[PDB]
Amino acid sequence: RYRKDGFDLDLTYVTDHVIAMSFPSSNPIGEVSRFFKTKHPDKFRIYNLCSERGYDETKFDNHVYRVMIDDHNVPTLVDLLKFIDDAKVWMTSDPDHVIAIHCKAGKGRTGTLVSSWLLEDGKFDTAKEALEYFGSRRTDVFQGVETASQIRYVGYFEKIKKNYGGQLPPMKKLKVTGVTITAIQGVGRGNGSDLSMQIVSERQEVLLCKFAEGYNCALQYDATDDCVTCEVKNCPVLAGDIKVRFMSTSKSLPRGYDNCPFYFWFNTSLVEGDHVTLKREEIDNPHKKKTWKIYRDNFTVKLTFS
């Protein structure tokens, strides 16, 4: 909460030249507008991260760069890298240039980008430390952002800079052929029969599996091992950023974010070998401690690929 000089904004200097803030709305817009004309005349660039809301960009002299991000989701890796390219040019061409980033609460989407920016600028060596740092300033890696996928996408940026020269890795395309869920008991009906899995690529559903009925799958429940294994059929070739959503017909599995019990993003080119396994803290929704009597410590989701 910034107070000085007549302004009263939800607005924070993450560094002297990096600002995190809330939605400039109608923080009232004319005041956010006044603040920048007053404190940073001609030296600001605003990044609106909301896929869902825009505003009068003219209150900021039309220096607003848009990144379309869903609430509780992530930018495309491409948009993330474009953002970093754009912020870098602007930051490095004038010592007085300042960037300000927001969507709604200046929390999860916002932390995904400033944390990446902090890595690009060399303040931190690792995603975890940039994340903990934005956490300090805007309330632990989960102070930094809201979701595990948001954490993975900062990890993705780190790995791009360290292993791939600051550019996108070689292209890999996948098909999902299997899904495996451990510690199934207590999750829904506890045997996988209430679940279905949706694969989303470029905002389109690209495959739906329904476990009990064998809709694009075959379900196998093993109670000895407290797990379910599902053969996945008819997966189209996947490429880029993929979101995998699990839904449930069951009354006692709550929906967390994104209107489903649990979900996750990954990028097909950053997958290693034949599979990706996610621990509980690495899945979106089970990562929240209020759900740990449902998703126990050995709850995992594995996708198998070919």
Is residue 80 a contact partner of residue 117, using CB atoms and an 8 Å limit?
Answer: no
In the three-class reduction of DSSP (H, G, I as helix; E, B as strand; rest coil), residue 186 is classed as coil
| 120 and 172 share one domain | no
- From the candidates 103, 217, 227, 235, give the one annotated as an active-site residue: 103
What's the CATH code of the domain at 93? 3.90.190.10
**Buried (b) or exposed (e) across 27-65, using 16+ Cβ within 10 A?**
beeebbbebbeeebeeebbbbbbbbeeebeeebbeebbb
Domain of residue 301, CATH code: 2.60.40.1110
Helix (H) or strand (E) holding 86: helix 77-92
Is the domain of 84 the same as that of 211? no
Please report, in angstroms and rounded to a whole number, the separation of the first and last CA atoms in the chain: 50
Contacts of 54 (CB under 8 A, 6+ apart): 48, 66
Distance CA 144, CA 280 (A): 18
Q: What is the CA angle 71-72-74, rounded to 5?
A: 90
Question: Which among 18, 281, 55, 6 is positioned nearest to 138, based on CA atoms?
Answer: 18
Identify whether residues 65 and 132 lie together within a single domain.
yes
Count of structural domains, the chain = 2
Structure tokens at 166: 């600051």
Which positions ≥6 away from 203 have C-beta within 8 Å?
none
- Which method resolved this structure? X-ray
Boundary residue ending a domain (141, 167, 193) = 167
Domain hosting residue 273, numbered range: 168-306
Are 217 and 135 within one domain?
Answer: no
Please list the residues that pair with 230 across neighbouring strands: 179, 219
The b/e string for 74-89 (b: 16+ C-beta within 10 A; e otherwise) is bbbbebbbebbeebee
- Let me know the angle formed at the C-alpha of 292 by 286 and 295, rounded to the nearest 5 degrees: 60
- The radius of gyration of the chain's CA atoms, rounded to the nearest angstrom, is 21
- In the annotation, is 235 catalytic? no
Question: 57 and 122 in one domain?
Answer: yes
Q: Are 225 and 176 within 8 A, CB to CB?
A: no
